[model samples]
Target: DVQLQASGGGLVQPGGSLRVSCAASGFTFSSYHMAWVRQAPGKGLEWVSTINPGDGSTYYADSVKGRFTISRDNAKNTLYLQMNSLKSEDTAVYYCAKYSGGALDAWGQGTQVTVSSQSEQKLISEEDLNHHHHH
Candidate 1:
């Protein structure tokens, strides 16, 4: 009956940052490790990061080894996935899950993130390009 609820996502500019949280219930938060998984819009799953609160140890996928941070907030029974220097390829649905039995079992609702280089002051321009054929 373990339940995990993840946060939502939004559009971000290149070089920007994002932090997604997963709130856990129905189990002891510190007793198990938590993970962050990413699935690009049309691609397969990618393990991004994990955190073991028991020892304050953290792990990261090679692709995100130096770019992501995994942490926990025990007081809120939550785990976080923080990323900086967002890029277009970082656009994906991020999932938070509990790790046990060498597998990720309980998972949360995924957060969608779309990083773009043209969304700063030209957020409307992208929409215009999408809707109007300028080519």
Candidate 2:
């Protein structure tokens, strides 16, 4: 039996940061991998990072490539996710998971996070460009 508890930001401004902590218990903290995952209001799941407490090895998902930092406290059996330069899209529910058999089978109850501020992000593709020019 394993447990993960998430505690951190509820709302953060843009270009700011949020650090969430997951204190794991009831399992071998080392010798296993733990991953951070996120999900927005209407979007799919995103893998943020993973930490191997045993060797201190870490891996990040391409989607979260440069916007986040992942660390672990082996002594306390805890993991941390610090996300910086946050965008509104960063608003989501973040969760921690215990890795196993090439997938995450054990997941923590998600922590809800909201990144809000003055930033208007729009998608501009070639088709959109053409349509905009025509209209």
Best by lDDT: 1
Q: Which residue pairs in candidate 2 have backbone atoms (N, alpha carbon, C) closer than 3 angstroms, thus clashing?
A: none
Give the alpha-carbon lDDT of every model. 0.76, 0.75
Off by over 4 Å in 2: 42-44, 118-135
Candidate 2 lDDT tens digits, 14-122: 8888888777776655766788878888666777887776657777887676888877765677778888988776788887788775555436667888877754456
Reference-based TM-score of each model: 0.79, 0.76
Our tally of clashes for model 2 stands at 0
9-110: candidate 1 lDDT, tens digit per residue: 778787788878778887656777788888886776777888886777777887787787888876678878777877676788887788774556547787
Residue 107 in candidate 2 has what lDDT?
60
RMSD of 1: 7.4
